[PDB]
Ligand SMILES: O=C(COP(=O)(O)O)N(O)CCCCO
Ligand SMILES: O=C(COP(=O)(O)O)N(O)CCCCO
Ligand SMILES: [Cl-]
Ligand SMILES: [Cl-]
């Protein structure tokens with residue numbers, strides 16, 4: 343059922359697995375993510391960014407998720423506001439029925455980030471909603487999370503989970519040269535905070551997905567994601583929520599491109615989007631197995 | 640808000656205009672249809688085929704429509720089961736919260752049609768839901784509607800509206816040679832029944848929509864829809880519900896193709912589906928003005 347984020351992530355923290363947190367912008371993405379969760383017996387974080395909420399309407403974002411949760415009541419699901427940028431944004435999400443919100447003030451000075459995050463936490467905790475915040479700057483290897491800052495930040499804000507920057511970045515172009523992450527830094531943050539941790543920019547760009555996209559005439563020149571083995575290492579190091587969006591998009595649109603390329607007379611939407619859903623579903627299912635949330639219901 | 644189909648079509652019948660009935664299969668189509676209704680200040684029939692209901696799930700089909708009705712509470716909307724094929728299908732729709740169902744047994748012999756239609760009407764009227772039936776086979780120019788058949792059919796079945804076959808057909812390829820419809824037959828049917836009438840296969844395939852689809856590499860060789868003038872003539876003749884599906888799909892997919900063509904690196908779903916929604920919304924807006932439902936709220 344729909345539950346507070348911390349219920350799902352505290353279990354993952356206790357047992358040492360990671361739970362994929364998958365973004366959606368419409369019904370097709372949402373359906374595919376739920377079907378994957380049902381097929382792999384996995385709990386789900388379902389995420390909507392502020393841009394996604396504007397596209398859908400916050401009423402429809404929550405409404406669709408509630409319908410899906412009733413379709414699959416045995417699956418623990420948290421509905422999460424990804425990259426909330428203001429107190430008001432988080433407040434609106436809480437009011438609409440989100441069960442988890444991220445307040446992202448990572449680019450503010452430490453004390454400003456802490457003050458804003460603390461303000462969101464007070465509001466969200468009053469409403470039974472969990473909160474994520476961020477420290478460090480998301481970019482490839484000051485910059486990265488400062489573990490002693492994290493220790494103080496978490497203690498003083500009472501935030502439920504923290505996203506520490508350890509060398510990932512958003513999007514399909516995460517690394518020029520060989521992938522590298524600061525796992526020692528991650529482990530120190532985990533020791534000092536002892537809460538669930540969140541990895542942003544965690545898409546892998548898997549080989550089969552890249553191949554699907556390129557085969558359909560797509561251009562992914564230069565793209566590189568987080569290696570599977572690095573995602574596993576991150577979970578061993580204390581990551582329990584693994585934000586994944588780009589992988590889902592590439593897989594889905596590859597299938598849309600393929601149909602568009604091949605059958606010029608095709609305009610039945612379902613013929614584009616059924617294959618697109620299937621590819622997205624399969625990406626999510628494999629990722630659930632990789633991170634270890636498979637079979638945790 | 641969500642109202643019985645007859646509430647909308649009786650007003651159309653009384654005041655002599657047509658109300659477009661638009662199919663959807665997902666959030667994008669539905670959102671575009673509602674935004675059109677809102678901008679044109681027009682009542683809406685929103686319909687879902689059994690195929691669309693399979694694709695979405697009936698819980699999601701109805702659920703999304705209810706959320707949209709809450710978003711635009713001032714718009715009269717009927718949620719209509721398009722081409723229901725069995726009593727059980729119509730019953731499932733009624734229980735799920737549809738406010739209008741079509742029982743399509745036009746392929747049965749006249750008395751089989753009447754028997755089945757009468758059973759559906761009894762069940763539907765008992766639940767405050769309106770009913771559409773059909774007489775004639777839906778091909779171009781025995782087959783077409785027999786006005787005397789219609790007279791008896793309506794009086795004894797108590798069906799709320801009737802779809803008489805007068806020369807239209809489903810899909811992009813309605814006519815070889817210049818379009819022709821049997822408006823005399825239409826007018827006779829209206830005179831004998833004096834209820835709201837429904838035109839199926841009413842897509843026009845507008846020049847600008849064709850142009851968009853062809854420009855994006857699509858193939859629509861040999862396609863022809865109902866001329867705008869003919870739709871206007873149908874409404875003058877007593878058509879109050881005008882089923883439109885193909886026009887919407889082509890305009891939508893034309894934009895998806897264009898996006899795929901113009902940027903091989905593009906895989907943000909919103910970048911595909913925002914232009915698609917806009918093209919679909921514009922088709923609907925123009926159709927509402929054409930049929931005369933603009934400003935009828
Ligand atoms: O942390 C996440 C996931 O990042 P990604 O899926 O690109 O690895 N996000 O904030 C999503 C951003 C998508 C980039 O355009
Ligand atoms: O009457 C119609 C629509 O007719 P059109 O194909 O002209 O849009 N419908 O009932 C919708 C489904 C038919 C498939 O196209
Ligand atoms: Cl940030
Ligand atoms: Cl039929």
Ligand code: NA
Nearest residue numbers: 424425444474
């Ligand atoms: Na997040």
Ligand code: NA
Nearest residue numbers: 720721722741
């Ligand atoms: Na119909």
Ligand SMILES: [Zn+2]
Nearest residue numbers: 512542543585
């Ligand atoms: Zn992120």
Ligand SMILES: [Zn+2]
Nearest residue numbers: 809839840882
């Ligand atoms: Zn039809």
